[PDB]
Amino acid sequence: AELVSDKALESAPTVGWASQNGFTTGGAAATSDNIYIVTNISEFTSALSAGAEAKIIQIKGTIDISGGTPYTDFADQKARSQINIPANTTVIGLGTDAKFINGSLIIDGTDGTNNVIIRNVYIQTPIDVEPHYEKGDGWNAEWDAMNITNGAHHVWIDHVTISDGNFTDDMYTTKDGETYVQHDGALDIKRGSDYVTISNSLIDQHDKTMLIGHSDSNGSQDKGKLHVTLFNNVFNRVTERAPRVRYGSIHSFNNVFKGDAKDPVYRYQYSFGIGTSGSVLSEGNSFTIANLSASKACKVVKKFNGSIFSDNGSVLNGSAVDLSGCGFSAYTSKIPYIYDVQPMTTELAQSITDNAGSGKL
């Protein structure tokens, strides 16, 4: 097929981990026969089967991963909804309505997957039709919007939007006196994955959001990996976990967080969650949390089994913050790439808001 989106040939920016120890170029080097334009699930997987071949897959309209047939059970959903992205792929949205629904975009590096670029597309979080019951922990949903696992590396998420969509948590029903939880995390990055850059993206309206380093026992595999750079993104109405990281080395700068500690549906808990052996370097970020007094600024960065967190020139409700008294060790590791962290202002944050997410490339 032909190439419509001209920016489809782009590679991740010099800035970020996805450009360290190798470049992320997706299917740029795709041959004309590896340049598709899918409009439905059949075509989508049909193209994706080019496997490790350089490919440019253009999304036109909404792709209903369910193919119109709702999932009968867990098996069914597992079987059909987990769409895999093969190495050297560039999934780019066309125009403003590039959307995916009833599924999960999986970047599983078990078969060597690497060098992926999901760009300019909306992914509405999937609804698990058969949540497991962890007695004492109640109902638990299974699928995310996008999962990067099993060593996957050199992935670039840009102008992507992950949201709950037409089905938000306040629409949950209740099964056996418990709340039928049908949403898992929005974006996951686990089991050895590395070199990831998320930019100009929007995660809006969701509970458990981004979990990096799924388990704090997996250490050995996760140790010294999971380098994620997040900049110019917007986390709006997300309950917890901008990055909630174990082992990882998160670089979140010039991002826009906006929520409300008393929201009716997604109550702000924190943004950065420093987990076991995790480290986060926050800079020039904008934290606009309704109902959050400056005298409680440390609510934005919560501890777990970690401590390495450093922030620079970020703001809470339009004014400089000081997380220094929150009790964290300094981020001593170096950032290999060169970068310009712009001084966060109302203009900037306002600007970042306008250009974050799909349909705005």
Which sequence spans correspond to the domains of the chain?
1-361
Q: Look up residue 337 and give its two tokens.
A: 């790439």
Whole-number Å distance between alpha carbons of 104 and 125: 8
Buried b (16+ CB within 10 A) or exposed e, 190-210: bbbbbbbbbbbbbbbbbbbbb
Which single residue is written with the structure tokens 């089991």? 191
CA-closest candidate to residue 237, choices 353, 98, 105: 353
Cβ distance 203 to 186 under 8 Å? yes
Residue owning tokens 């967080």:
257
* Both tokens assigned to 328: 């964290």
Other beta carbons within 10 Å of 258: 18
Strand order from edge to edge, sheet including 279-283: 35-38, 55-59, 89-93, 114-119, 153-158, 194-199, 227-231, 249-253, 279-283, 308-312
Q: How many CA atoms lie within 13 A of 178 on its CB side?
A: 14
* Chain position carrying tokens 């450093």: 310
Q: How many residues does the chain have?
A: 361
Q: Is 194 flagged in the annotation as binding?
A: no
Resolution in angstroms comes to 2.9
Assigned token pair, 184: 């898992």
Q: In whole angstroms, what is the distance from residue 346 CA to residue 344 CA?
A: 7
134 labelled ligand-binding = no
Q: How far apart are the C-alpha atoms of 312 and 281, rounded to whole Å?
A: 8
Q: Specify the amino acid at residue 334.
A: K
Q: Which residues are catalytic?
A: 241
Q: Which residue has the tokens 């170096």?
A: 334
Q: Write down the experimental method used for this entry.
A: X-ray
| CB 285, CB 230: distance < 8 Å | no
How far from each other are the two terminal CA atoms of the chain, in whole angstroms? 21
Give the per-residue SS3 of the chain: CCCCCHHHHCCCCCCCHHHCCCCCCCCCCCCHHHEEEECCHHHHHHHHCCCCCCEEEEECCEEECCCCCCCCCHHHHHHHHEEECCCCEEEEECCCCCEEECCEEEEEHHHCCEEEEEECCEEECCCCCCCEECCCCCEECCCCCEEEECCCEEEEEECCEEECCCCCHHHCCEECCEECCCCCCCEEECCCCEEEEEECCEEEEEEEEEEECCCCCCHHHHCCCCEEEEECCEEEEEEEEEEEECCCEEEEECCEEEEECCCCCCCCCCCEEECCCCEEEEECCEEEEECCCHHHHHHHEEECCCCEEEEECCEECCEECCCHHHCCECCCCCCCCCCCCCCCCHHHHHHHHHHCCCCCC
Q: How many CB atoms lie within 10 A of CB 287?
A: 30
Q: Is 142 annotated as a binding residue?
A: yes
Backbone φ and ψ for 357, nearest 5 degrees, come out as 105, 170
- What is the CATH code for 1-361? 2.160.20.10
Cα separation values, 270 from 117, 243, 279, 299, 345, Å: 28, 10, 16, 6, 21
Closest listed residue to residue 47, CA positions, set 84, 101, 8, 96:
84
144 labelled binding-site residue: yes
**Nearest-CA neighbor of 51 among 8, 112, 105, 92?**
112
The tokens describing 2, both together, are 């032909």
Phi and psi for 283 in degrees, rounded to 5? Answer: -155, 145
The one-letter amino acid at 314: S
